[PDB]
Design a binder for this molecule. Structure first.
Ligand SMILES: [Zn+2]
Length: 257
């Protein structure tokens, strides 16, 4: 069930997607005192210098910035991953208030928003085939807290007026996603799922410990988008996050002592 479309509340998804009650669902709470350092993890390699952004789309549940993934231009490797994973799109989840909005939590703390950079394993040839595999995707998660403005984010905030309603898109070329990363690449990792329908259990999650700060005025502009299509009754695009799901039989590993 991916693509342009409104979603109902996450508590109803299990009626259409039974995997919503599965064994490796995301997001989860990260208990920092139970995650174990893993000296086996190799260092993480983010290679975004040749990234090619194309378009920004309001898909009725978030906005996606889409990349050319027809070649290895923007890739993720190392860490817990085997193989090369190609960036296809990034998007955010955010709240109606600064005290809520993230999907993952850290010792039950909620951040104001969470950025997801989605990558697919090139040995499966394309995104559609990759989501049918347990190691098909790698999603880099980054928390946002409210404080100083993030310069690298402002070109994104600037174009949201042109994609206010469901189904609208705008050109979005030459955007450099390195401007959204924090200073440190220390992370937690665990096996999980997509956090929207169809909720497939195909993701290796890499969640960064250091948040980035964005300004109150930047997040206020996220809250002006609409879930609805033009000419329909107005619904503000807020609180588009899924709550923490049971960890079940999984261990969270840390890249740092
Ligand atoms: Zn997401």
């Amino acid at each position: 069930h991916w693509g342009i479309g409104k979603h109902n509340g996450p508590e109803h998804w299990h009626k259409d997607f039974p995997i919503a009650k599965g064994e490796r669902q995301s997001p989860v709470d990260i208990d920092t005192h139970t995650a174990k350092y893993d000296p086996s993890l190799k260092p993480l390699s983010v290679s975004y210098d040749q990234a090619t952004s194309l378009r920004i789309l309001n898909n009725g549940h978030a906005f996606n910035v889409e990349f050319d993934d027809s070649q290895d231009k923007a890739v993720l490797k190392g860490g817990p991953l085997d193989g090369t994973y190609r960036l296809i799109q990034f998007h955010f989840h955010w709240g109606s208030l600064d005290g809520q909005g993230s999907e993952h939590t850290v010792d039950k703390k909620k951040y104001a928003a969470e950025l997801h950079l989605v990558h697919w394993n090139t040995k499966y040839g394309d995104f559609g085939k990759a989501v049918q595999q347990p190691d098909g995707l790698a999603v880099l998660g980054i928390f946002l807290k409210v404080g100083s403005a993030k310069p690298g984010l402002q070109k994104v905030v600037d174009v949201l007026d042109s994609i206010k309603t469901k189904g609208k898109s705008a050109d979005f070329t030459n955007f450099d996603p390195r401007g959204l990363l924090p200073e440190s690449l220390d992370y937690w990792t665990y096996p999980g799922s997509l956090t929207t329908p169809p909720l497939l259990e195909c993701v290796t999650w890499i969640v960064l410990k250091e948040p980035i700060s964005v300004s109150s005025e930047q997040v206020l502009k996220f809250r002006k988008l609409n879930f609805n299509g033009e000419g329909e009754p107005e619904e503000l695009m807020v609180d588009n996050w899924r709550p923490a799901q049971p960890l079940k039989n999984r261990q969270i590993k840390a890249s740092f002592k």
